Amino acid sequence: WTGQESLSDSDPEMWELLQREKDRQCRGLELIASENFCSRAALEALGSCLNNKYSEGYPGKRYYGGAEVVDEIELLCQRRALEAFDLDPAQWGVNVQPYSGSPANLAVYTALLQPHDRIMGLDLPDGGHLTHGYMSDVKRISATSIFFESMPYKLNPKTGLIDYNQLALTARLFRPRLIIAGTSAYARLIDYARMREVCDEVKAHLLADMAHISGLVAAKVIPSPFKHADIVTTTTHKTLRGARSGLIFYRKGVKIPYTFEDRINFAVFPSLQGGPHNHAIAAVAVALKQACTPMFREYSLQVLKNARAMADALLERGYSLVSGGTDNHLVLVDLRPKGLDGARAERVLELVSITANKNTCPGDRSITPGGLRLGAPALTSRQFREDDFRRVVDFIDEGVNIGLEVKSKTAKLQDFKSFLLKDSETSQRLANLRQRVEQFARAFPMPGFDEH
Amino acid sequence: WTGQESLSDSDPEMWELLQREKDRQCRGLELIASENFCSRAALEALGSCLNNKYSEGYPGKRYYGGAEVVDEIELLCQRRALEAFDLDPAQWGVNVQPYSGSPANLAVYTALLQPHDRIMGLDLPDGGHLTHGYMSDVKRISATSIFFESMPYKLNPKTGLIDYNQLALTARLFRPRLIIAGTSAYARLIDYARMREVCDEVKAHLLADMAHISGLVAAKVIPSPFKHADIVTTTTHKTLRGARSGLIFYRKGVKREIPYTFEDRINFAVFPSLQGGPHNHAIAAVAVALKQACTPMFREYSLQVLKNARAMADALLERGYSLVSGGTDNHLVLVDLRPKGLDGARAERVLELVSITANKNTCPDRSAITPGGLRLGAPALTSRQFREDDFRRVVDFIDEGVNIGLEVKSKTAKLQDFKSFLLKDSETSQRLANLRQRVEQFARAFPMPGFDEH
Amino acid sequence: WTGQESLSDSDPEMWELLQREKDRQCRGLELIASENFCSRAALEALGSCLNNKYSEGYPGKRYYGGAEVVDEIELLCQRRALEAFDLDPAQWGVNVQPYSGSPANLAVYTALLQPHDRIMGLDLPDGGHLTHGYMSDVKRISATSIFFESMPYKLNPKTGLIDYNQLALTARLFRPRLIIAGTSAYARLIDYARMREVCDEVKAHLLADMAHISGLVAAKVIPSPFKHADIVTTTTHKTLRGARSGLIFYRKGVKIPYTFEDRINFAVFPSLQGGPHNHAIAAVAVALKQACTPMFREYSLQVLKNARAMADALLERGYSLVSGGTDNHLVLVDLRPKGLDGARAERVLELVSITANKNTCPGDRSITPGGLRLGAPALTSRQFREDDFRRVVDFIDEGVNIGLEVKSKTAKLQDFKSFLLKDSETSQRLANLRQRVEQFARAFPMPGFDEH
Amino acid sequence: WTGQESLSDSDPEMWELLQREKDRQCRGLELIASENFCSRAALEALGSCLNNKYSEGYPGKRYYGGAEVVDEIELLCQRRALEAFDLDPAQWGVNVQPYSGSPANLAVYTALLQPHDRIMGLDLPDGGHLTHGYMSDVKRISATSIFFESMPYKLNPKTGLIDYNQLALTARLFRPRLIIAGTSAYARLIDYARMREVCDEVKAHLLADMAHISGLVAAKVIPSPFKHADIVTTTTHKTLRGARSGLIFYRKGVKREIPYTFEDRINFAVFPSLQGGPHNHAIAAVAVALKQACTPMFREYSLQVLKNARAMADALLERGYSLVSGGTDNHLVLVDLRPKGLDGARAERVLELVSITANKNTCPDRSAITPGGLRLGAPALTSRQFREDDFRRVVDFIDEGVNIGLEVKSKTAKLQDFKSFLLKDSETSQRLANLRQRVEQFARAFPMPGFDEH
Numbered sequence A, C: 001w002t003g004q005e006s007l008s009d010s011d012p013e014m015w016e017l018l019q020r021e022k023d024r025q026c027r028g029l030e031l032i033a034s035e036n037f038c039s040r041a042a043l044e045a046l047g048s049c050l051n052n053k054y055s056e057g058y059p060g061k062r063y064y065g066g067a068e069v070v071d072e073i074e075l076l077c078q079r080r081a082l083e084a085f086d087l088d089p090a091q092w093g094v095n096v097q098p099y100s101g102s103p104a105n106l107a108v109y110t111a112l113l114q115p116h117d118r119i120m121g122l123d124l125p126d127g128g129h130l131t132h133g134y135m136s137d138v139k140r141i142s143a144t145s146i147f148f149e150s151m152p153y154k155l156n157p158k159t160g161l162i163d164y165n166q167l168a169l170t171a172r173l174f175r176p177r178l179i180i181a182g183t184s185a186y187a188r189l190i191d192y193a194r195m196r197e198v199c200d201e202v203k204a205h206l207l208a209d210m211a212h213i214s215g216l217v218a219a220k221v222i223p224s225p226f227k228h229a230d231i232v233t234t235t236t237h238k239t240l241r242g243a244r245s246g247l248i249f250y251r252k253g254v255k256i257p258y259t260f261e262d263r264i265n266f267a268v269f270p271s272l273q274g275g276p277h278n279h280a281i282a283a284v285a286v287a288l289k290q291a292c293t294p295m296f297r298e299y300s301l302q303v304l305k306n307a308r309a310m311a312d313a314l315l316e317r318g319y320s321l322v323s324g325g326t327d328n329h330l331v332l333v334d335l336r337p338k339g340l341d342g343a344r345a346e347r348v349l350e351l352v353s354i355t356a357n358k359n360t361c362p363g364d365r366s367i368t369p370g371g372l373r374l375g376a377p378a379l380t381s382r383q384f385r386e387d388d389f390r391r392v393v394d395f396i397d398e399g400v401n402i403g404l405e406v407k408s409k410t411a412k413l414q415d416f417k418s419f420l421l422k423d424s425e426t427s428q429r430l431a432n433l434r435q436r437v438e439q440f441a442r443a444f445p446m447p448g449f450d451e452h
Numbered sequence B, D: 001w002t003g004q005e006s007l008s009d010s011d012p013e014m015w016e017l018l019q020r021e022k023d024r025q026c027r028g029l030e031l032i033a034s035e036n037f038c039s040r041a042a043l044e045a046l047g048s049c050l051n052n053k054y055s056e057g058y059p060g061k062r063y064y065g066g067a068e069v070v071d072e073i074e075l076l077c078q079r080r081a082l083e084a085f086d087l088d089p090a091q092w093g094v095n096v097q098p099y100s101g102s103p104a105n106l107a108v109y110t111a112l113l114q115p116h117d118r119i120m121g122l123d124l125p126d127g128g129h130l131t132h133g134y135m136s137d138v139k140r141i142s143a144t145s146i147f148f149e150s151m152p153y154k155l156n157p158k159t160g161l162i163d164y165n166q167l168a169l170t171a172r173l174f175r176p177r178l179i180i181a182g183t184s185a186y187a188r189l190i191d192y193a194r195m196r197e198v199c200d201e202v203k204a205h206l207l208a209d210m211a212h213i214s215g216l217v218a219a220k221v222i223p224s225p226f227k228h229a230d231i232v233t234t235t236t237h238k239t240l241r242g243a244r245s246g247l248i249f250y251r252k253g254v255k256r257e258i259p260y261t262f263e264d265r266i267n268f269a270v271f272p273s274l275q276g277g278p279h280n281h282a283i284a285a286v287a288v289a290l291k292q293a294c295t296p297m298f299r300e301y302s303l304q305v306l307k308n309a310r311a312m313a314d315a316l317l318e319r320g321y322s323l324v325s326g327g328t329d330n331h332l333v334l335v336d337l338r339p340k341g342l343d344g345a346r347a348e349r350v351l352e353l354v355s356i357t358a359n360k361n362t363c364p365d366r367s368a369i370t371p372g373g374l375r376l377g378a379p380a381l382t383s384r385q386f387r388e389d390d391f392r393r394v395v396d397f398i399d400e401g402v403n404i405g406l407e408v409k410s411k412t413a414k415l416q417d418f419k420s421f422l423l424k425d426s427e428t429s430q431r432l433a434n435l436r437q438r439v440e441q442f443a444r445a446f447p448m449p450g451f452d453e454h
């Protein structure tokens, strides 16, 4: 045994599963707003010998020795991170060791807050993320709601926009130590200047969680939260199109000096994490280099055009969009007017190789959602353009109409799901649409390796 | 732009760094006990298209669709995990989504404990890990000590072994809800039976953190913690020789029929409580390594790890070196350098300059910035087909670096003067260059798992 | 030494101080809304041999023996407590061991909540009490804000009333485990039914802290919070006219059964307190017996008439009242229109033997307050009637006019305070008013002993 | 209605209860170590018009006006407190507003600690108080254990004394921020010097809870905790023979000039953090009792308390009774009844039925519902002019009740059968009535501090 045998020869069962997933991605219309297709260059670093290096600590401050190369790799990733977002190294530092987006947020809370200190994020059914402090009326769900005390702020259901006025009102009463400006299902630009004013009034840190829009921020196609935020967290995948990892940007210099650097770094290690994933760090550095190129600005501009073309196409077919439209990479469809819910439509679309996720509309109470979240980054990476996304909406409309007919023939949601598989005419009607969807999607190029 | 260009074509700066690190790993004598060299098969899965799939939730209960293949991969990783450690699926479950070893431990505490509940683990200078509850005398270090109340149990300074009697005494007073039986720097086997007895008396959970010895447990070359522990966490790298990830094993079934209530709490703590989207590429790489851990090849590898560790221990004893707890019974050796005139901080930088990677280790000592001895591991070089004689020559190379450090200590004052002379003195740098020359020449001859150039 | 010597002979220095304070109470116009004059009957029990009995535990469940009499005294106090507020013993229990009003509230929180569980009370400058969870923008002040997580609710500054709508809005976001319906400076009746609806919606306990209005509740001159609250706390002094102690009323029976009794009792002892103060318990029982008499209903009715007469008199002199008037025992005067603040007026009134306390008006930001809280219970106990309180307002008006003239001759507040003592003409003008105030007050009877 | 009618005229039911309790106190032999009989001078201040004054805040910094007289009373109580324990006002301050002993302790924890900070006190069955951090094995009992993390230190079961060595060992591991040197059932003197050394090593606050021995410390008949402790809490009753209230003494001044930071934190925790309006009537009654504690009369009283406690201990030893820790050095005796055939639960109910009030006490035992022996105190009866011979007759009365209980145990099964036969058996109830007859006849002859009929 040498450890140099290929996966194809060593583990054929796992190699086959890799090919099955690769085929599923190539043949499907990927519309999950948080999904992207990572480049082969980054994947080559993700699966590299850098997995074999324990480098606990930070460049120059390592527990072990023999870290001279991974120090260069981590320092280069930091430089490329600051360059990708046009940041002055005298004003901004960055930690590239968070294992993912969720560990990045937990590191910020651990760094800047005491246990049970107060946090305000956008409510989960309103578009906020778990790590912004979600707990139901029955249970603390996110650990951010366990180790810290969270209170959400809400959208204005009439406009579908963040209610910045109610946030200001409630933050004055709740007195949060940190407020999160960042979303998972929000089609509009965040008023970071207004978030900053609220934070300054109540003496709270402003954290910008730009995970969904980080690639758009780097390409300078939407306003940057770095002009207003004290801390900026993000995933390294999603619109950044990198390997799965996290980043913590923090201000340094004159605030009285900023005191984020040492607290943020200490929270990541040794407080929360162990050995860094240097293979992910390198793959992140490869992606950040790509994010600085004119290619990536063209890609991010096309992401905006494709999302607007998808929004326009849906509006012409008689669909309603939460907040009327979109200013970023995703679209929030409200399907309740058309007579279908997000749970039924998401299941029908999934069976025809169209991946979307149901989304709560401002009307419901988190109640099967009557909405759908659609994203452009993944297919735009496959060189989809405006006309291609209009064709995507055509396929979506067929799936919705199939779900409408099954709804008239079924009662509960489980009867709906079972009817899509047991009924013969519905089965073949879905099979025909699935086949037409996959031939269309297979023709587009796919980033990454050929077989896996 | 297609995203299919090679890394060497599209980013030569990063490709050069990848090759330099690969050349550093190939030419060096890796002796860090927590290090290993991942197989190429697992690395091909680690850098795969599985990075492009959000599968929040668990098989059969995802939040998105399109998870049909990653559900098979996650379920296969679970089955391969239960098989690798010879567990009945009716009595044991496993979560394969922890991002690393530290997230695996924090998920267990979040699943089973309320904030500020009490935790007992081996102290960090005594061989424990950070995530077992390490807080100093001026600040709380690990988040284990922030979100929960931790009190350490210590070694017996006369024997170098865990003081199970003092642990039993202090556990009756501290009343912990969870005790961690797991180590980061400990050369002997843990009495999990005595650990279970202490936990059963104070009515605390027994968590086994076998991250350092997971490969040895899977190959059944050392006693398994699963016979006494309710929860077992581990890394997927180190002795398991996989990609960097974590695992949480938990008891299932009957503890009328009073059932175990670990599964739903453990899974919920991992997601949605603590983590976001799983790293499906790591999960597949773990499943590749877990399959290898079931083969007779892996049993022979872990057996060689044990013999190499004892051969390194005996080769050290026969050259005037003291060993904490006398010797070893697992994969590492805790060498005590103070009955030699040198410390762990001085020796590790000398060894690092001759391509020999080790880490300083606190011995059962006086100061802390100059810890006692070193921690040396077997699994890394054993994966490079190292035999007993090969490690005896490694000890030969170590002893030569030890003597160079002892001579530099004679010409230098404090630590900074010691390290500065290693790079500034002409005769010293040339003497280090020669030893590094023969160490690298000796290490390159051995094979290396993974790819060829990266 | 026998321990039977009188205080007059044993400690003349302390006996003189007792007489000095007694004279100060007899000669002063006591307008602090939380003050009353305890009867001699209750004071006789307060300073009795019951101080010499350690009775940790509860009637029948004592740690020690020889508690047969104090068990009868504690059980009688409970029966008189339930009778005073017209409570069915099958529906209500009562703990008579809280050392004061603040220990009573802390016992309820400890009994029903976990550390850092959420609490909503009226903001302190809005009329709420410390023990309802007060913390400034700089510091956790009340231990209720330290061991538990509090968020206040506010008055509507346009009306001076509790903003029940904003409470409902914010309670839905804050998700409190307990909401406090009770005030220290509020001249209106609390909508306990609306508080109950908010609590039922968010699954919170409704605690009614009736300390200021307990005597009014017992006499049935204002609506009772026992019709809507799960728990009711109160002081035993103030409008109840007893010794200083506390009470915790709790529902028992069918809620599914109520589980307040064992948790409340365990929280008082052994969790929080030690040995009960049986001398206070007996003095409380004496007061509760008085609260059941037709005399006490006449007293409480006169308290309402006197407060309304004081409010009407102030309105006729051109004063403004927060919320327009009063429905209970106190009046909230807003002095900012007259050109004087509460801090200046309270100091001038104090020097002429008129005891009031400055009070924040809904306009200020907690800024020397421009308001005054005036209370009727204390002087009503001295047989003050409507015309007597109109004479009190006459004296108050003179003091305000003195403060207005000193304000025109001084700059800072410290210059104002110093001018009232150093300036000769201001000194004698205050001395004349003080003399006229004290002759008027001395003529009225005073509950308690003659000399002390 | 004037509010000036007498209690006997306006509430005869309550007046009768007051007289019955006064008659019970006069006719009984009060042996509870925490009990005492307050002087009439203090009771006249306790039930005074000072109940009618809200004085939230502190002298010179009140929230209301009209506090000119209560400011003098509170300041005089402070001066009398500092004088009673012979403290330099430049080095010690005192808060006289705690409602009782338990509020005084909670105020110190709130002032000096964050929630869930660590606290070490003597375990409750070992002689500690609830407010020192008592939590059982199934639930947290005292709020000390809820809002803060407490770990108990234990007695040496072979000597009955505090195991200062095990306390030093466990304090290095638990790392408490505050250690309480104070007891509720402990017959020996506390080594505050050893307590300060342990606190100085682990860098924890040393709080002395002298509530049981405050009168003995003021009269300088036992060593004072103020020489070693930074904070000292106490009740104002018990040995101090005052009204029920509490005190918090704290170090002031210089610990450049690094000052003590106790005063502002302690005062703020009492008000506005924890308490509302002070009980000015209790504060004045405390000042009356604190003045008495400075007189040579009180020194002779505390000396008699010590001799009466040792006379009661010797009278017990000479009748076949074992004493925890061998004997006593303060005001109480810890009698161990198991080398006699009876338990504390059975003896205390027999003694209670003959007007002899004691309490069961856990001895260094097997069970808990039937604790070992009893706790007997001297200060109560010593205030009734009891001499050494008087307590030797008290032991005579106790021993007679002990023997009646031993005979009832021979005819009964468990505890409920024991207590039921004491009231149901004709010969037993008549034998108890005779002993009660002579106990009450012997106790009534002695004077009683306070009023005559209430």
Ligand SMILES: Nc1nc2ccn(CCCc3ccc(C(=O)N[C@@H](CCC(=O)O)C(=O)O)c(F)c3)c2c(=O)[nH]1
Residues within 6 Å of the ligand: A124, A125, A126, A127, A128, A129, A130, A136, A141, A184, A185, A357, B056, B063, B268, B272
């Ligand atoms: N706007 C927005 N859109 C999206 C789309 C994807 N995500 C990321 C995950 C979303 C999420 C996570 C956990 C729960 C959750 O808690 N589920 C169960 C627990 C299971 C159990 O009980 O077994 C519960 O409710 O308890 C949830 F309902 C939803 C987001 C997001 O975060 N925000």
Ligand SMILES: Nc1nc2ccn(CCCc3ccc(C(=O)N[C@@H](CCC(=O)O)C(=O)O)c(F)c3)c2c(=O)[nH]1
Residues within 6 Å of the ligand: C124, C125, C126, C127, C128, C129, C130, C136, C141, C184, C185, C357, D056, D063, D268, D272
């Ligand atoms: N409506 C209403 N009216 C009244 C009238 C009397 N009271 C009862 C006490 C009121 C109160 C208590 C504490 C603070 C307070 O915190 N002060 C200082 C601390 C001192 C320091 O710093 O040394 C601070 O602000 O820190 C306060 F400003 C006010 C109330 C009430 O409770 N409510």
Ligand SMILES: *Cc1c(COP(=O)(O)O)cnc(C)c1O
Residues within 6 Å of the ligand: A273, A274, A275, A276, B034, B100, B101, B102, B103, B129, B131, B182, B183, B184, B209, B210, B211, B212, B235, B244, B245
């Ligand atoms: C390695 C190890 C950890 C941490 O693993 P990471 O992958 O670095 O998070 C924790 N505990 C033990 C016992 C370990 O051996």
Ligand SMILES: *Cc1c(COP(=O)(O)O)cnc(C)c1O
Residues within 6 Å of the ligand: A034, A100, A101, A102, A103, A129, A131, A182, A183, A184, A209, A210, A211, A212, A235, A244, A245, B275, B276, B277, B278
């Ligand atoms: C994606 C996302 C996260 C979590 O990222 P993971 O890599 O899944 O941990 C957190 N917050 C926001 C706003 C996100 O978009």
Ligand SMILES: *Cc1c(COP(=O)(O)O)cnc(C)c1O
Residues within 6 Å of the ligand: C273, C274, C275, C276, D034, D100, D101, D102, D103, D129, D131, D182, D183, D184, D209, D210, D211, D212, D235, D244, D245
């Ligand atoms: C008496 C005592 C207490 C409690 O006193 P209370 O007045 O009952 O609150 C606390 N600690 C010690 C050491 C005591 O002796």
Ligand SMILES: *Cc1c(COP(=O)(O)O)cnc(C)c1O
Residues within 6 Å of the ligand: C034, C100, C101, C102, C103, C129, C131, C182, C183, C184, C209, C210, C211, C212, C235, C244, C245, D275, D276, D277, D278
């Ligand atoms: C008076 C009052 C308190 C506190 O009473 P104290 O006896 O001073 O502790 C608490 N809450 C309210 C509403 C009060 O009126």
